[PDB]
Amino acid sequence: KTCPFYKKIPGTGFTVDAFQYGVVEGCTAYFLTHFHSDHYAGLSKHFTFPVYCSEITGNLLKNKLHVQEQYIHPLPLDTECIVNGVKVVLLDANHCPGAVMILFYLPNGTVILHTGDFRADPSMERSLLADQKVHMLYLDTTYCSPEYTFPSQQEVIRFAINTAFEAVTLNPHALVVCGTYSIGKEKVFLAIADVLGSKVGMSQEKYKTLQCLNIPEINSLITTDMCSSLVHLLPMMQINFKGLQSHLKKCGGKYNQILAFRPTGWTRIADVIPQTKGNISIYGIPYSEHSSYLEMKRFVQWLKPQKIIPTVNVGTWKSRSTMEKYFREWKLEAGY
Ligand SMILES: CO/N=C(\C(=O)N[C@@H]1C(=O)N2C(C(=O)O)=C(CSc3nc(=O)c(=O)[nH]n3C)CS[C@H]12)c1csc(N)n1
Numbered sequence: 001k002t003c004p005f006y007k008k009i010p011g012t013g014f015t016v017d018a019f020q021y022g023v024v025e026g027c028t029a030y031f032l033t034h035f036h037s038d039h040y041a042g043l044s045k046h047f048t049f050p051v052y053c054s055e056i057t058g059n060l061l062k063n064k065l066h067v068q069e070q071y072i073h074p075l076p077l078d079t080e081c082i083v084n085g086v087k088v089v090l091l092d093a094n095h096c097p098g099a100v101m102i103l104f105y106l107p108n109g110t111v112i113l114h115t116g117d118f119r120a121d122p123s124m125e126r127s128l129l130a131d132q133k134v135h136m137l138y139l140d141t142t143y144c145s146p147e148y149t150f151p152s153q154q155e156v157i158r159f160a161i162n163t164a165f166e167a168v169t170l171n172p173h174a175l176v177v178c179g180t181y182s183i184g185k186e187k188v189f190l191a192i193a194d195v196l197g198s199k200v201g202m203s204q205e206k207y208k209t210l211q212c213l214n215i216p217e218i219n220s221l222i223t224t225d226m227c228s229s230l231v232h233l234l235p236m237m238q239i240n241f242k243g244l245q246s247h248l249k250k251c252g253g254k255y256n257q258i259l260a261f262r263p264t265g266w267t268r269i270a271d272v273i274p275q276t277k278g279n280i281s282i283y284g285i286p287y288s289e290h291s292s293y294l295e296m297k298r299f300v301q302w303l304k305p306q307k308i309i310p311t312v313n314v315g316t317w318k319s320r321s322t323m324e325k326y327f328r329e330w331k332l333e334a335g336y
């Protein structure tokens with residue numbers, strides 16, 4: 001495949017999250033917004049062009065994908081930087097650790113925001129974004145439809161902490177399991193382990209990944225000694241009745257209950273009822289690191305871009321058409 005147009009920044013030689021197309025012709029610099037596999041797809045130890053990213057993303061490139069250090073160009077956040085003759089700023093995307101949005105200040109006075117993947121927040125409206133007009137927006141449209149309503153991260157964490165704390169205080173032999181398949185959503189397991197006074201147990205591979213994320217005091221919070229911990233991280237693929245029944249056999253049968261948390265259910269918060277089989281309960285918690293529809297709408301209506309380019313769900317005519325209809329509705333409502 002060749003690089004799609006929505007991964008190219010016009011008036012520049014820049015691409016964003018475009019590593020799976022080989023040598024992109026006329027690309028002078030490759031930006032990586034965050035360390036999720038659809039975005040880094042293609043990077044390896046044999047990559048020989050400059051990669052611009054956050055420090056955390058660079059740590060993950062170095063240690064997990066074995067990208068050579070000479071090609072990793074970490075940039076600080078909230079700082080005007082010049083990359084191949086163009087002023088850029090990286091901003092926190094409120095996504096996963098190391099995830100950024102990129103502001104490009106084009107020679108002709110155009111300003112472009114690329115959100116990477118993000119969860120829009122009103123905090124962004126009082127940030128550096130407020131200090132200049134932004135003309136073009138490359139937008140994370142993951143949940144650009146009104147049925148995507150889910151609660152705040154804080155509300156979801158409140159539910160998870162309360163559920164776990166109650167269960168473990170009632171039954172000291174209970175185990176909490178959190179599923180994972182990528183970086184992001186670390187707050188779920190860290191918050192639960194904090195309330196329980198436990199470290200989070202995990203594989204060496206997961207431990208290594210977390211050690212790349214610049215989380216303060218991380219050494220006090222995580223461990224590879226599983227049976228010393230009340231909170232385990234497992235691959236998301238194991239979060240099912242058979243997988244958790246098998247896990248219950250570990251640590252000499254020390255545990256007699258599992259409460260597992262699986263991020264899901266995007267389409268009150270107390271109405272989260274688990275799927276239960278005997279002493280295993282699986283809670284499908286709607287913890288998202290992407291904008292809800294209303295969050296996305298608010299951000300775009302505040303920013304008032306002249307042109308929106310979706311970067312997600314662009315593969316079907318139906319999805320493209322429906323997104324463009326929402327953008328038009330938003331524009332007409334707000335008057336821009
Ligand atoms: C709230 O849970 N949301 C989940 C999820 O983790 N679902 C659970 C899961 O894997 N479940 C399974 C089962 O084990 O097959 C089932 C199937 S019912 C069942 N399967 C058995 O194998 C068994 O021995 N007894 N019973 C009764 C119900 S949903 C639950 C989810 C959302 S997306 C995704 N892939 N999973």
Ligand code: NI
Nearest residue numbers: 034036095117
């Ligand atoms: Ni992502």
